[PDB]
Amino acid sequence: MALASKTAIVTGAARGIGFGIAQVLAREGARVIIADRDAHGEAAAASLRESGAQALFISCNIAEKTQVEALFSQAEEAFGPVDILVNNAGINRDAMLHKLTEADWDTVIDVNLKGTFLCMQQAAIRMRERGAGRIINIASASWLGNVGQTNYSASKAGVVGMTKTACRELAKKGVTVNAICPGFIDTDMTRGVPENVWQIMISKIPAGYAGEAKDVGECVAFLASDGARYINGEVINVGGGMVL
Amino acid sequence: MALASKTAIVTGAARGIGFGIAQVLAREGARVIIADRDAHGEAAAASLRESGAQALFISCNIAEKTQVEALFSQAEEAFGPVDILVNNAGINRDAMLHKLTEADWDTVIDVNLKGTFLCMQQAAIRMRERGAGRIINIASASWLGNVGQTNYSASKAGVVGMTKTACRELAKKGVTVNAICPGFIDTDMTRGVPENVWQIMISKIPAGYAGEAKDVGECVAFLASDGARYINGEVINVGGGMVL
Amino acid sequence: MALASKTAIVTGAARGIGFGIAQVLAREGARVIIADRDAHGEAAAASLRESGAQALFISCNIAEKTQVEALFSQAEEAFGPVDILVNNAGINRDAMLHKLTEADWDTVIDVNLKGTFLCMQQAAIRMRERGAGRIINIASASWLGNVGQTNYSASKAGVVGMTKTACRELAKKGVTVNAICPGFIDTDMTRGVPENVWQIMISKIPAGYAGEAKDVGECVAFLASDGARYINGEVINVGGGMVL
Amino acid sequence: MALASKTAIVTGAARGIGFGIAQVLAREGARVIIADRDAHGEAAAASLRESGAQALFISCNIAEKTQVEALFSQAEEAFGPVDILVNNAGINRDAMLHKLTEADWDTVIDVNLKGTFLCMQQAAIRMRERGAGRIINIASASWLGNVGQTNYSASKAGVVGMTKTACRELAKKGVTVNAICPGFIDTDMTRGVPENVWQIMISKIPAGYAGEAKDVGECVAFLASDGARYINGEVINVGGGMVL
Numbered sequence: 001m002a003l004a005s006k007t008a009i010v011t012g013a014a015r016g017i018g019f020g021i022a023q024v025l026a027r028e029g030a031r032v033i034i035a036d037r038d039a040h041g042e043a044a045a046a047s048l049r050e051s052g053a054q055a056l057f058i059s060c061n062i063a064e065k066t067q068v069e070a071l072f073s074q075a076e077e078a079f080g081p082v083d084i085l086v087n088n089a090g091i092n093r094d095a096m097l098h099k100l101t102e103a104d105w106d107t108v109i110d111v112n113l114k115g116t117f118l119c120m121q122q123a124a125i126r127m128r129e130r131g132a133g134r135i136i137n138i139a140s141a142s143w144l145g146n147v148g149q150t151n152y153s154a155s156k157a158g159v160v161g162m163t164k165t166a167c168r169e170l171a172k173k174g175v176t177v178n179a180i181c182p183g184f185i186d187t188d189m190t191r192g193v194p195e196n197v198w199q200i201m202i203s204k205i206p207a208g209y210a211g212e213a214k215d216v217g218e219c220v221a222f223l224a225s226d227g228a229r230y231i232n233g234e235v236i237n238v239g240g241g242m243v244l
Numbered sequence: 245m246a247l248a249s250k251t252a253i254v255t256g257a258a259r260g261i262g263f264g265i266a267q268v269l270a271r272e273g274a275r276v277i278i279a280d281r282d283a284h285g286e287a288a289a290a291s292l293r294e295s296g297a298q299a300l301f302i303s304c305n306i307a308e309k310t311q312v313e314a315l316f317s318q319a320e321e322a323f324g325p326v327d328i329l330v331n332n333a334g335i336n337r338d339a340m341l342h343k344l345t346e347a348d349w350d351t352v353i354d355v356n357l358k359g360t361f362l363c364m365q366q367a368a369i370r371m372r373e374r375g376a377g378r379i380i381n382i383a384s385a386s387w388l389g390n391v392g393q394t395n396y397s398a399s400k401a402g403v404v405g406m407t408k409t410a411c412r413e414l415a416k417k418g419v420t421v422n423a424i425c426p427g428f429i430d431t432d433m434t435r436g437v438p439e440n441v442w443q444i445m446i447s448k449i450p451a452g453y454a455g456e457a458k459d460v461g462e463c464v465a466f467l468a469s470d471g472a473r474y475i476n477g478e479v480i481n482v483g484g485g486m487v488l
Numbered sequence: 489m490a491l492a493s494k495t496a497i498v499t500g501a502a503r504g505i506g507f508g509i510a511q512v513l514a515r516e517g518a519r520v521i522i523a524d525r526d527a528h529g530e531a532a533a534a535s536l537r538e539s540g541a542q543a544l545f546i547s548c549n550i551a552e553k554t555q556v557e558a559l560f561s562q563a564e565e566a567f568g569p570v571d572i573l574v575n576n577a578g579i580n581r582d583a584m585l586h587k588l589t590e591a592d593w594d595t596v597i598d599v600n601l602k603g604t605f606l607c608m609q610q611a612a613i614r615m616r617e618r619g620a621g622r623i624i625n626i627a628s629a630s631w632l633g634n635v636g637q638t639n640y641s642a643s644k645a646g647v648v649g650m651t652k653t654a655c656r657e658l659a660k661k662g663v664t665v666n667a668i669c670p671g672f673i674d675t676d677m678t679r680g681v682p683e684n685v686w687q688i689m690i691s692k693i694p695a696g697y698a699g700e701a702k703d704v705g706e707c708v709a710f711l712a713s714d715g716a717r718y719i720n721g722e723v724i725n726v727g728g729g730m731v732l
Numbered sequence: 733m734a735l736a737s738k739t740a741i742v743t744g745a746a747r748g749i750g751f752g753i754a755q756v757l758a759r760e761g762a763r764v765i766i767a768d769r770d771a772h773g774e775a776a777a778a779s780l781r782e783s784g785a786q787a788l789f790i791s792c793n794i795a796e797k798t799q800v801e802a803l804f805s806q807a808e809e810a811f812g813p814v815d816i817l818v819n820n821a822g823i824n825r826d827a828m829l830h831k832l833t834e835a836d837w838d839t840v841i842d843v844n845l846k847g848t849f850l851c852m853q854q855a856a857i858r859m860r861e862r863g864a865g866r867i868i869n870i871a872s873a874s875w876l877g878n879v880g881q882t883n884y885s886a887s888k889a890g891v892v893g894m895t896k897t898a899c900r901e902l903a904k905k906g907v908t909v910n911a912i913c914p915g916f917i918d919t920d921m922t923r924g925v926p927e928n929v930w931q932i933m934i935s936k937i938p939a940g941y942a943g944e945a946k947d948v949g950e951c952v953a954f955l956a957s958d959g960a961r962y963i964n965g966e967v968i969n970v971g972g973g974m975v976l
């Protein structure tokens with residue numbers, strides 16, 4: 001029970017990787033705020049409660065500062081000081097560089113990059129006064145480039161930059177800020193693809209299988225623990241050796 | 245005369261690194277569009293003309309798609325197909341993570357990241373049809389983190405991500421896309437800093453001095469030449485060995 | 489008890505980081521072989537036994553293939569199949585590039601690089617047949633350069649290269665191979681340094697203090713567990729955010 | 733004529749990449765020492781002389797300190813102070829990690845890593861007193877791992893480590909030390925492979941073709957010039973965007 005008596009916000013935790021992260025944190029004893037724009041977040045929180053954990057859904061669009069301020073206020077009123085923030089919420093609006101619309105650019109930056117910043121900021125305001133904390137950002141293997149992902153790669157590389165900046169500003173205050181880059185993970189987004197394509201992606205992964213949400217969760221749980229106090233500003237790939 | 249009969253757009257070329265880049269490109273025979281939001285860009289273009297080069301100022305705010313579309317239209321009407329794009333325009337609005345205003349976040353992302361995207365997009369639309377081209381993005385040593393630069397580091401890491409994405413999309417079309425990360429360069433932006441700070445930055449540079457605009461220019465000119473056809477998706481530091 | 493019923497070899501585990509790693513692995517239930525060239529390794533093993541763990545010292549100079557073959561034979565006779573190898577043993581013989589003697593070059597490469605290879609090889613021979621395993625190499629922040637460390641940086645960068653190579657060869661066989669780069673850790677090697685130097689290294693560490701052996705140990709224990717099955721070929725810095 | 737009145741040693745310049753580098757340096761006006769263990773080096777030097785350049789073959793096995801000392805003595809007696817050292821000489825003795833013989837390990841480290849060190853050392857002794865110089869090391873895309881190349885990847889990552897170390901020690905003395913990582917280059921070593929295999933390797937290169945020796949040469953020539961004085965400790969890939 002490595003995270004007993006700790007409070008964690010996981011953004012985008014209604015489903016997929018976020019939900020897997022929330023399960024693992026809950027398994028290790030954390031009180032978990034499921035922060036999501038979608039109301040299925042209530043079902044995710046309920047699922048954690050049914051397994052014996054303490055959990056609460058808070059509706060939040062991370063791209064809106066006032067909603068993010070409200071998320072942190074409410075979270076702390078309910079479960080006390082936020083020890084752990086996991087910035088997992090994100091979207092794709094893929095297109096080739098020459099075709100990408102301004103709207104599809106704007107929206108991906110707004111959620112993945114700005115939204116992540118807004119949450120990091122709220123965590124930082126609080127954590128720097130308490131002298132403790134964990135911020136863990138979910139980036140992507142696409143941060144060093146991927147076809148069709150000018151907006152997404154920009155946003156996720158941006159997240160890595162902020163991660164490293166925040167490490168420098170907050171490390172002396174007892175806070176760690178790290179990034180995880182999932183490789184190819186089995187979720188709803190990756191499942192709905194022709195089976196021939198799936199096999200091509202698998203053949204790019206030296207380990208020979210797609211990861212699960214819980215593989216990302218295990219790495220988050222480790223970075224969130226006291227044993228990872230000296231890991232700061234890192235980018236850890238969770239992709240079975242896969243070089244995108 | 246490595247760039248004879250080539251047309252280059254250099255954004256942010258009214259002063260500083262951009263102007264140095266434009267000088268070197270002009271020295272190697274390029275026709276140079278000085279693209280800048282500031283009207284001093286006319287004086288910069290005039291200075292190149294007085295030295296014997298062909299040059300033209302076009303007023304442009306790279307954050308506005310319609311102005312960027314106009315920049316490329318006019319550039320091509322005047323000097324023919326754009327062979328080389330140098331995305332140098334950028335700004336700082338520094339602040340610690342816990343203090344950074346939403347406006348200061350927005351503006352830096354809008355210029356450095358989105359602006360760079362808009363220009364890359366216009367270049368890509370054209371260059372992929374011609375089967376030739378050079379895109380060179382000026383990032384920063386701050387892309388892997390720097391105190392006070394949550395917004396700036398996000399934006400510049402983002403530029404690195406897009407650079408690598410564009411390399412993957414465009415390399416087979418005979419186009420290279422690379423990034424230069426200047427370290428500490430002597431310009432108007434770095435000169436207007438307390439003298440105590442300047443000395444701290446100098447002591448971080450193994451070479452023992454601040455670089456000049458022309459040092460960045462020389463690297464741009466090399467990447468722009470036919471001899472660098474096989475360099476693609478690279479991040480080259482021009483910082484006298486400086487590890488930020 | 490994440491490593492119950494697992495057998496681990498930790499090279500260089502008589503003292504310092506190696507001994508800390510061995511403690512943490514033992515705490516999580518592993519049977520630990522203390523492999524070291526120094527006979528104080530018997531005391532380290534005894535200390536683990538006195539705390540309730542199973543542990544055995546085996547004398548070994550990792551630079552000698554025949555001794556490494558003997559280490560693995562004996563280890564397996566005593567505690568059964570080796571599930572985990574931690575290549576921690578290493579030395580410094582620092583000197584500026586222009587002064588470094590051939591003997592001091594030879595010895596550092598022989599231990600840090602070749603020794604690590606020999607042990608990796610023995611682990612690989614066995615692990616690839618069993619379809620399971622963990623190899624964790626202790627590299628150094630010096631792998632991307634450090635004054636006075638031509639031989640050491642060469643050796644540790646070399647270790648990173650082998651780590652990534654081995655990930656590619658072994659991942660499909662259910663084995664992970666990862667590297668940890670400690671930053672500045674408080675051990676016998678770092679304590680025996682002029683006090684003026686110590687203070688300079690501390691001022692480079694954003695966290696504000698030198699790490700302990702157990703900080704490296706916690707990261708090893710995580711990578712050795714089933715929860716890190718999808719982390720492969722990584723280089724994880726354990727240095728309180730320190731950029732050397 | 734960017735390198736007029738400069739003296740360059742290129743190791744391994746009897747054929748392949750080394751010979752291409754020597755051609756480009758000679759084209760830009762350098763006096764070139766072809767340093768090689770093979771006597772075909774005399775023919776390579778003769779070929780440069782027939783094109784109008786000044787060139788000299790010196791027999792040298794870079795793994796032997798006394799021969800390297802002799803190489804630098806003779807080179808300077810013939811063509812005056814060595815301004816540029818290109819450490820290109822290297823070998824492969826590939827094998828899987830579990831099969832690699834001790835002899836094949838030893839020989840690759842001895843040539844690629846130790847040999848490169850010995851030459852760097854001789855250059856450094858001289859260049860640090862003169863207050864000027866260029867060292868350019870040919871590494872490989874394999875430095876971040878490649879199947880069957882435990883020894884080669886170790887050796888080439890090692891070269892990158894030394895490169896960065898030497899940058900830190902020598903930058904303040906007006907010397908730059910950089911590394912080039914060729915991707916997939918058309919030489920005698922790469923030509924002797926079944927044509928079906930070659931096409932698979934080509935399809936992994938975003939640029940869509942294999943590089944030539946002269947592509948590496950162009951990058952060396954640039955780094956060797958005065959225009960690259962502010963590039964130091966860099967690893968530049970010359971591989972058409974190819975991520976190994």
Ligand SMILES: NC(=O)C1=CN([C@@H]2O[C@H](COP(=O)(O)OP(=O)(O)OC[C@H]3O[C@@H](n4cnc5c(N)ncnc54)[C@H](O)[C@@H]3O)[C@@H](O)[C@H]2O)C=CC1
Pocket residue numbers: 011012013014015016017018035036037038060061062063088089090091092111115138139140141181182183184185186187188189190
């Ligand atoms: N699927 C994969 O294999 C990989 C995923 N990632 C990243 O990991 C993270 C999780 O991805 P998945 O589970 O695959 O995605 P998903 O789409 O299954 O889940 C995303 C969740 O975030 C929420 N969300 C979206 N926009 C939001 C906003 N503005 N405010 C609050 N919540 C919002 C959604 O409602 C949803 O519940 C994302 O950041 C994704 O980009 C990175 C690499 C690979």
Ligand SMILES: NC(=O)C1=CN([C@@H]2O[C@H](COP(=O)(O)OP(=O)(O)OC[C@H]3O[C@@H](n4cnc5c(N)ncnc54)[C@H](O)[C@@H]3O)[C@@H](O)[C@H]2O)C=CC1
Pocket residue numbers: 255256257258259260261262279280281282304305306307332333334335336355359382383384385425426427428429430431432433434
């Ligand atoms: N000076 C340094 O040490 C470093 C500079 N950089 C980057 O290099 C680039 C140039 O830097 P400096 O010359 O120091 O900057 P500077 O501030 O001296 O000049 C920047 C130029 O860019 C133009 N510009 C700004 N926003 C624009 C827009 N939206 N549209 C069109 N033009 C615009 C400005 O009008 C100005 O002419 C910037 O992107 C900067 O972030 C990166 C690392 C270090």
Ligand SMILES: NC(=O)C1=CN([C@@H]2O[C@H](COP(=O)(O)OP(=O)(O)OC[C@H]3O[C@@H](n4cnc5c(N)ncnc54)[C@H](O)[C@@H]3O)[C@@H](O)[C@H]2O)C=CC1
Pocket residue numbers: 499500501502503504505506523524525526548549550551576577578579599603626627628629669670671672673674675676677678
């Ligand atoms: N302390 C620090 O801040 C850092 C340490 N490291 C690395 O961490 C590892 C451990 O370092 P410390 O515990 O600080 O050093 P240490 O010198 O205190 O302990 C080294 C141990 O390894 C053993 N060893 C040396 N050569 C050997 C050989 N040929 N065969 C078997 N055993 C051998 C020694 O007998 C000793 O027991 C080393 O590889 C070192 O390079 C890396 C970065 C920072």
Ligand SMILES: NC(=O)C1=CN([C@@H]2O[C@H](COP(=O)(O)OP(=O)(O)OC[C@H]3O[C@@H](n4cnc5c(N)ncnc54)[C@H](O)[C@@H]3O)[C@@H](O)[C@H]2O)C=CC1
Pocket residue numbers: 743744745746747748749750767768769770792793794795820821822823824843847870871872873913914915916917918919920921922
């Ligand atoms: N061919 C390729 O695609 C790639 C080559 N490289 C590296 O680039 C460099 C040149 O490669 P190639 O031209 O293909 O090699 P090559 O095998 O065609 O030529 C290498 C030259 O180095 C010489 N040499 C070998 N050992 C020596 C020693 N101990 N002292 C002095 N000279 C010695 C040989 O006699 C030969 O003339 C090597 O370091 C190689 O590992 C790296 C990545 C890809």
